[PDB]
Design a protein around this motif. Sequence first.
Motif, short mmCIF file in Angstrom:
data_model
loop_
_atom_site.label_atom_id
_atom_site.label_comp_id
_atom_site.label_asym_id
_atom_site.label_seq_id
_atom_site.Cartn_x
_atom_site.Cartn_y
_atom_site.Cartn_z
N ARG A 177 1.69 -6.59 12.12
CA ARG A 177 2.13 -5.26 11.71
C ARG A 177 3.34 -4.80 12.51
N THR A 195 -5.70 -11.78 -1.87
CA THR A 195 -4.99 -10.75 -2.62
C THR A 195 -3.73 -11.34 -3.26
N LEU A 245 -9.41 -7.03 -3.25
CA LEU A 245 -9.64 -8.31 -2.61
C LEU A 245 -10.78 -9.07 -3.27
N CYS A 266 7.31 0.43 6.82
CA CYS A 266 6.79 1.25 5.72
C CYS A 266 7.92 1.75 4.82
N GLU A 287 0.31 -9.44 3.60
CA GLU A 287 0.51 -8.09 4.12
C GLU A 287 1.71 -8.05 5.07
N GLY A 338 1.24 2.79 5.36
CA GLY A 338 0.48 3.16 6.54
C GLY A 338 -0.50 4.29 6.29
N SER A 363 -0.70 -1.91 3.45
CA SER A 363 0.75 -2.01 3.44
C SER A 363 1.38 -0.65 3.74
N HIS A 412 -13.43 -12.35 21.30
CA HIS A 412 -13.57 -11.38 20.21
C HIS A 412 -13.89 -10.00 20.75
N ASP A 447 -3.69 -8.84 17.97
CA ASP A 447 -3.46 -8.24 16.65
C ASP A 447 -2.43 -7.11 16.73
N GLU A 468 -10.95 -4.31 11.89
CA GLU A 468 -9.94 -4.12 12.93
C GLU A 468 -9.08 -2.89 12.63
N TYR A 482 -10.67 -12.41 9.79
CA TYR A 482 -11.09 -12.48 8.40
C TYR A 482 -9.95 -12.08 7.47
N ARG A 535 -13.77 -13.11 0.22
CA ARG A 535 -13.74 -12.65 1.60
C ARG A 535 -14.23 -13.77 2.51
N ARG A 560 -10.77 -0.23 13.72
CA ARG A 560 -10.99 -0.34 15.16
C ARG A 560 -9.84 0.27 15.94
N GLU A 586 -13.56 -7.27 6.50
CA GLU A 586 -12.11 -7.41 6.51
C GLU A 586 -11.42 -6.16 7.05
N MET A 601 -8.35 -10.03 21.66
CA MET A 601 -8.05 -10.14 20.24
C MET A 601 -7.35 -8.89 19.72
N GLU A 602 -7.77 -7.72 20.20
CA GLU A 602 -7.10 -6.49 19.79
C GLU A 602 -5.65 -6.47 20.25
N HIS A 645 -5.52 -1.95 0.77
CA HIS A 645 -4.35 -2.72 1.15
C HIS A 645 -3.58 -1.95 2.22
N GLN A 697 5.12 -2.07 11.50
CA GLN A 697 5.80 -2.08 10.21
C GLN A 697 6.79 -0.94 10.06
N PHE A 708 -11.92 -16.22 14.08
CA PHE A 708 -11.23 -15.24 14.91
C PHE A 708 -10.53 -14.16 14.11
#
Lengths: 288, 288, 286, 288
Positions: free
Chosen positions: C282, C145, C240, C286, C225, B166, B164, C268, C277, B190, C141, C243, B193, B187, C273-274, B162, C284, C139
């Motif tokens: 995100r 959860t 998870l 934290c 998330e 970091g 969440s 892709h 994303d 990325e 996955y 999937r 990546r 999943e 796409m990067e 998860h 975030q 595009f």
Amino acid sequence: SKLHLRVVTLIEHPFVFTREVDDEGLCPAGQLCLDPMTNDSSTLDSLFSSLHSSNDTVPIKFKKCCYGYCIDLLEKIAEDMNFDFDLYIVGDGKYGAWKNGHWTGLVGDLLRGTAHMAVTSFSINTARSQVIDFTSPFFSTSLGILVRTRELSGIHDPKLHHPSQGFRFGTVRESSAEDYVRQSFPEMHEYMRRYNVPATPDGVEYLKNDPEKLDAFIMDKALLDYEVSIDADCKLLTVGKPFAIEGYGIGLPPNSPLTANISELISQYKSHGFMDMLHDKWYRVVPC
Amino acid sequence: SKLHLRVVTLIEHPFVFTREVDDEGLCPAGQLCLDPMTNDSSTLDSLFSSLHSSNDTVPIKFKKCCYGYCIDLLEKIAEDMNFDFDLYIVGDGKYGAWKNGHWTGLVGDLLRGTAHMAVTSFSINTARSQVIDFTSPFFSTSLGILVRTRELSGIHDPKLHHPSQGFRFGTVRESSAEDYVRQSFPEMHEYMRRYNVPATPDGVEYLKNDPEKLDAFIMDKALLDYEVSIDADCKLLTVGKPFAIEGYGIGLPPNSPLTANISELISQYKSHGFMDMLHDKWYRVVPC
Amino acid sequence: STRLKIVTIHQEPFVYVKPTMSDGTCKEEFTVNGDPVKKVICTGPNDTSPGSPRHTVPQCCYGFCIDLLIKLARTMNFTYEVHLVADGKFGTQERVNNSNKKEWNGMMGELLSGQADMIVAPLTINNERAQYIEFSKPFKYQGLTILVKKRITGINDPRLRNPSDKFIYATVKQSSVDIYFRRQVELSTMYRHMEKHNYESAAEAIQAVRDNKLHAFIWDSAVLEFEASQKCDLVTTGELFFRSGFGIGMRKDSPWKQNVSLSILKSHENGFMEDLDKTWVRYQEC
Amino acid sequence: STRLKIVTIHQEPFVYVKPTMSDGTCKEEFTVNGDPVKKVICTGPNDTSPGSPRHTVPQCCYGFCIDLLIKLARTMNFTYEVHLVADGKFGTQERVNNSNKKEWNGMMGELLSGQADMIVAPLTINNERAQYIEFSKPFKYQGLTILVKKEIRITGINDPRLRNPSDKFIYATVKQSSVDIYFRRQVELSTMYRHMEKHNYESAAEAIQAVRDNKLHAFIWDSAVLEFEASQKCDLVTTGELFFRSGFGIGMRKDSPWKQNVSLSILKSHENGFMEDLDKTWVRYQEC
């Protein structure tokens, strides 16, 4: 025109029950059931002839009442398909397994043409599917563990695999659990065959024994949950993740006809909610 | 007289090393290898033709001394099969995977008919096995996790599932330690990546640098086990359990005729005495 | 051909619906790295409450999915007019039972009828749900959860399997997760309990979880998330399952099909796409 | 017809080895319930460990295998003689200083040289032995685990404590056995095999005495043997996951005339109930 067919059934809770017949000899929402603990078909034939005979039949010891899930399910199916039925509590009450050649219990009786209809909590096994035919399942359930209260993860834990000097298990003598255990690992097959019980509605009192005999009762989840619910004292609960997801199904003779109609009827009834209705009618939830 | 081959290798300790060449130039206890930082076969061909001539004009930066476990094993095959070889380093040095339709790196240079052999740390798997030819394995590997000083449960640890809180980490880019993850576990692709490393020494240096940039790591068990046991503080370690074991091998073109003998020779040295010798000679230094 | 009418939905971070000013234009919102954020004018209802008959004036739409739509428009040379969903439910196979017929709802029904067909939204990929429409290459996955109030092992846990009165767990009404919880005959005891509580959208589940209610909540991975990221009061737990991946939808053999998948596969790779994303997901606290 | 001559090895609790008393008559023992036991005369290497071949006066043998063989010989009316293995190893493959065949030793060597007819012993039936000689269908199942001193904890084989070759946690297995051959053929980790080779014990009983004293800290042997020899002496407790489930069989020559009836008798005894009679008699719980 009217087709008469016999029905073989065990005594397994929720799915089946029993009741002592009244003096007059009637059962509301149930049919009279005999007690012929004989495997031969000719005695069954003469017993049924006496049943339909004008002369008085076998006394009360061969008569009982019944009510349950599959009983009313088969009642509506037979009402739809225009036929009647008769029931009796097998001869062995041992489901069926391969032993000394010919099978036992339901499989042995069906392969021997003693009946044409088998309705119970009958499990699904590929080995049984080789010889006998199965219809569309009308239920699905798994196996659990029953232990008195006061963290068994299931089958993949060291607490159960090797003998930790005083841990005992046990299932039905030749149920679907026995076959799966034997095909998976035979050392535990021998280990529980040391202490295996003959029938389910006995193991629970072992748990009332201050148990030195049995400490696990691996069996199907439906009866396990019902026995949990009926436990007013709530000194027991099912533990461990489900394993070996299985299904139920009405038994039929090998290559027997009219299976497509029954399967389609079961599918339509499940789609229309009859299964849900009976599920909430019989399967009851009690906080424990 | 003898066969003449061109062989491409990589730079990964402890399987293959890289020692600076001497002033006169002999590469004591080793051979000479070249790296012009290009995937063009024609350049390589003219460079090799110039090198083995009566007057060679090549840059000094292109010449390095190559020696190690894998190179010694290649030397024995050269002794047994009686063929001479030239050695050179991959144009970019990133193993090989799918990218823009065509292959890349080691696999791409094999397919594009640049070198006749590919001998190095080379994890074989389904994707590469169906396009080119591989010999019998001479090693068994695994995948491990490296964490700096100041704890995981394996691969199903909730910390790395998860995203969440970091976390960090990611395998080396464009290798078999990520193709398995990408194909069989998409999943968390990325997330790996964004946090990846070009070369394994660069990644292990990123993990061992303050401030912590990329905590944790995923790579082959053997390389990590060698890399942990050369530091003085001996603070890094390996956590988890083995998973996704493939095994190494020697790269070969698309089923060239020599695909058969080499396999049986490697089987012979594996059986008789060579693997143990050769393995103990390089996995040294005392654990702290 | 040419003009295409598209259908979207409201859920962070895929398409916000923040209303515009009185003039009609949309105020220039700013991104992290000094760029303008693309936005479109999208018409739709004014939710169940308020309004006259839920036919309100246009709103503004901008987020992740809209960027993909704009890229498709650039690479395909076609024009669009995006409008919102009438109800808001994702769309599952339903039976009116007044004529023994199966009819869809929400996006699925508004696609099969034909008044709008590009469904540019993160629907799902499903076996039987996509059995008479054609999806495209995913595009992104995700998994199924579960989010809880500030622990649960997973789907194999006796609190989840049997509550009594104070461990109710629900999901959004009439969506994809309901299909998969209903289909599995192995896992069908909990679904009846889930028929007791089910909310219309994700915001209601958010408010339930925040305000001492809804001990659990099951939804997509990415939305959950980001939710636990921005709102620093709830944290996810549990490994998870299921999937799968999102994807664009088209009617059966619509005359675009191939080029959509080619563009998705091309984007892709490289940095598109990067970048999406990184800039829309995100970042975030934290 | 012909006088089959047998060959067994000393292994408790399957066979017992007790010295001949005075003149030669076997001592008359008894069971808990008073049922007498049967023993046979065995002429093996009595003197000592396999050094000098001194006085070989026969001793008395009995146990689990001996009762099974008595039952086997009582049928098909064939008389028998029994003698122990001169070497004392479980028939593995080894080479010599002029290695050109890599033949067998111990039981396998003794039976492949044409002077033995039956091998009644708890020997694992693996692939290679099944290739070179033909077995019968198993009469008992097992899975090899490990034990340790009773802390006055380990889980499986993948536990990181046992993987790396340490110096303060020396462990091994009796040499020239099923465990050694199965671990040698399996690649997994060659360092594991190298660490095992350091302290491979010579017998299956001295290792248990050593692990009871303090010497080695892990014994890797079969299931039933370890379980009995641990639960019988209240100093050792086993912990594992039962990897490599297999069985014990009876190996005659390559299709001897006696092969067809051995399987029939063994299944008749397996299904009738004789297996329970022997198992309950010679395998019980005393400490707990």
